[PDB]
Every structure is written in C-alpha cells, then in structure tokens.
Amino acid sequence: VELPGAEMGKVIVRFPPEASGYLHIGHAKAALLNQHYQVNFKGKLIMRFDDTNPEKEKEDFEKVILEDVAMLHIKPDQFTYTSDHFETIMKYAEQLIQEGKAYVDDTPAEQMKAEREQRMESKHRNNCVNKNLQMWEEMKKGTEYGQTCCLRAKIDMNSNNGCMRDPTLYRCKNQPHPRTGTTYKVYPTYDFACPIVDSIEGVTHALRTTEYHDRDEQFYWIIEALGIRKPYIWEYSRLNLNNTVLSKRKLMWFVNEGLVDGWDDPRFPTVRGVLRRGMTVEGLKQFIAAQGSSRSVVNMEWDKIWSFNKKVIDPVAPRYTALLKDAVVPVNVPEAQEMKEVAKHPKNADVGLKPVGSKLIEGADAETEVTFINWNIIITKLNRNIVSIDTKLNLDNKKITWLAETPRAPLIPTVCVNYEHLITKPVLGKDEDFKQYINRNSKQEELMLGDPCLKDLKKGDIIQLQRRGFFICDQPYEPKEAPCILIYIPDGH
Ligand SMILES: [Hg+2]
Ligand SMILES: [Hg+2]
C-alpha cells in the first residue's frame, strides 16, 4: 500500500459515484480504499455526485447512496456535485475553442465512429475559431441543429490510444437539470469532467480501476492544455467475484422476474444485500485491506471474503440454541425442578451470560446410552411409532443441545434461512449469459424453536446457533405472531 507523494494532512481523495442505483460490492471497495488513505494520512475525503448528465441521475438514489456510504461507516469531510462547477467547466471549454484546441462537429455518430477506428480526421477538425464559436452558441442556445453537434478536443487522431482521438467534451441535452435547471443546454462529458473537477477540488490522488488506464493520457492532456494543477492517478484492481453479476440491467432482470424480493435481497451483491446477509463492515474492510492496491485481474471466490468475516464474528458472537419443530420429540427427565445463568461465549467472558427442568430434543438427535452442554443423562426406554423418550439422571461422569419446555421461559418462534448463488456457474462469460444458469430455487426456510434469550434479538445482531453455525437476525420477534428470522452466514471454504 505505497502511495507516492503522500504527506500527513495533505492527501485529498474522493469517491465519485453517480446517483443512478444502489451501491454494490465493487463500489464498496473503491470507497473503502479511499477511506483507507483519508484515515492513514489524516487527509480529506470528498464525496462527489457525478451529476453531469441531467437524465439518468435522480435525487432519490442520492438518498440511497448516502445511506449506503453511512452503513459502510465512511464519514466524508465534504460533499459536492460536479454541477457545482458547470460555469467553470464551460469557461475552460470556451478557452480551448479560443486557442483552437477544440472544434464543434455535427458528423453523424456511425460515421464519427468509423473515422475514429481508421484514424481519420473529421470534416470539421480544421474549422477556423469563429466558425467553431458560431456552432458553439448554437449548442448553447439548445437549437435543433445544435442538438446534432458535439464539442471535441483537438488531440491526435493518429494515436495508439483511442482515448486521444479527439474525444467529445460537451453534448447537447434539452432536459432541465435537477440543480441548475434550464440555465444550461449543454453538459460536459465525464472525460472532460474528472480532470477539471478533481483539480478545482484539490484532489491529490485520484483512484481508478485498471480498466481505465487509457483515460490518463487524455486527462493529463486536458490538464496541461488548461494549465491547472495535476493530481496523481492511482490504480487498483476491480472486483471479479464468482457467481456474481454487477450490471444494473442484469440485476433488475432478477428483480422483475420475481426471483429476488428487492434490491437488498441477501443474494444480491449490493452493499445492502451483503450486509443483510451477514457481512460485517470490519470483515469487509479487512479483506479490502489485505488487497491494498494489488493490481491483478483475478477471479474471486466469495468464500475468501466470508473467511475474513468468520474471524471477525467468531470471537464475540453469543451462542444461543435452536431446534426444529416438526422433527422434535418430547423428553421426560424427572430429577430437575427449576435456572442456571451460564455464559454466552465459552471463551470470552465479556460477551455476557444467559439464563437457562423436566421436558425437548429433535428427530436427528433421537438416535445419536450414557454428556450435556452447560451441564450426563441415561435414558430409560423409547416408546415407539419415536414420539417419546424418558430417562433418569446423574451429573457424575464423562455434545447435545436441548430446550427445556419450562413454563417460566417459553421458547421463541424461529426461522432458519439459507441462500445460495442465483448464478450457478462461477466464472461465466465467453459470450455466454447468466439468464440460463439460474439457481431457480435459491432459498429455503426451515421452521424452528429457539432459546428464550432470543426474545431480545435486534435486527442486525449476530449470534451463533449451536451445532449449526453463525446467524444474523433478519427481523426480531414481536407478540397472529411474527417469528425471529435468522439468516445463515457463510463461513467460507
Ligand atoms: Hg459527437
Ligand atoms: Hg477512451
């Protein structure tokens, strides 16, 4: 994790998401890495909404994304909007026309694309300055002919880097902007956006994934043409997880086709779904922090992330107990007449202590005789088709959970839930599609019955059922009825 130029109190980084949907696991990495540099260098972290486009971006997701940031426990020092700088950006666009480093172009898109591939020059590239300015005021006044034009930088159509072949800087859009309204009929591209905004806002270290290394040459070009200050660009590897798709489009297919109950479904790779599934922020930051800025294309097994999480939650989760209900058998031990206040984590005493006479067990337990936990039974006989077993007792001697059917503390309606990937093929692609690797049954519910110290579970508490594994309370119990829903936390393999 070596950062060139990084001095204490002088690092300024930014997370620049566009308010067009939910944040996902990939966004969570970019954001957690930025936080890392903010925290380690006592620098500024700027959150900036990319709002250059008046269409796709909606202020409803603005709330969604801020709540997503918060639940990752990321605490930005300043919040901004690209549109805060529309006036400055346009003055730089105009500066460039004036110097002959930009030109306006009405060339139809298909033909523009074909010229770029064959490194050809546009019929407009050599417009004199006043003609460009004429076509520019056309664009600025939102006219029907200007809506067919394009503003382009004058770089190098012979470049090996497609990014240097006269990129578009400004396009014509007649939609009102949410914040600037109808003041502007023309709007900057992202490619003209980052350099100037990162420079005005003082950003020192601009993080990107390796996929966009071609843009750097173009950015430094913009930055040198204007003479503004130049941030470092710092790169890291994007997140390639098996069985996973991130595309907004492909995820909303799962939403419409009703295989997933919403954008925070625990099977979804959104920040919400991952957390609701049992991921902790500490587990995520750790796995992120083991990455640092590794820069390698690598297919990721989710279970590597869930392993870091197991190490987080295991030394702190309290151990309760649950059993089913349609495979349970009554028991009679006649030697105990009422509560033992035993611990809740066998090793760390600081987690707390929980409270636990003559009546249950389960089906699968009813066949595996002379040990109990937090407690050595020797059973009389099994009266048969098993539906009852009675026993005697004695604590002197030598691996079994049980729920006493005491009237004092009755037991809580529980549901254990389990999930697996919606996509059954790990590393899928090679012009294939996911739409036909669907784990068409991806959820199972199993009605159960749990220890009374489950009456008090809050949504988000992480416990450990004994003999089953780690769970997360999806919804609490409340006095029909409403069960305490517990979701199975993958432990990584
Ligand atoms: Hg264009
Ligand atoms: Hg490019």
Author numbering: 188 to 525, 527 to 544, 547 to 549, 551 to 559, 564 to 565, 567 to 571, 573 to 582, 587 to 599, ...
Which lines from the publication concern this structure?
We also determined the apo GgEARS1 (residues 176–706) structure at 2.5 Å resolution. The helical subdomain (stem-binding domain) connects the catalytic and anticodon-binding domains. The electron density map of both the Pβ and Dβ domains showed significant disorder in the apo GgEARS1 structure, indicating that the regions are highly mobile. However, these regions become ordered upon binding to the IARS1 C-terminal domain, which consists of three repeats of a β-grasp domain. GgEARS1 contains a distinct hairpin loop unique to vertebrate EARS1s in the Pβ domain. This loop is located at the opposite face of the tRNA-binding surface of EARS1 and is oriented perpendicular to the longest axis of GgEARS1. Because the GgEARS1 structure is the first eukaryotic EARS1 structure, we briefly compared it with those of other related ARSs.
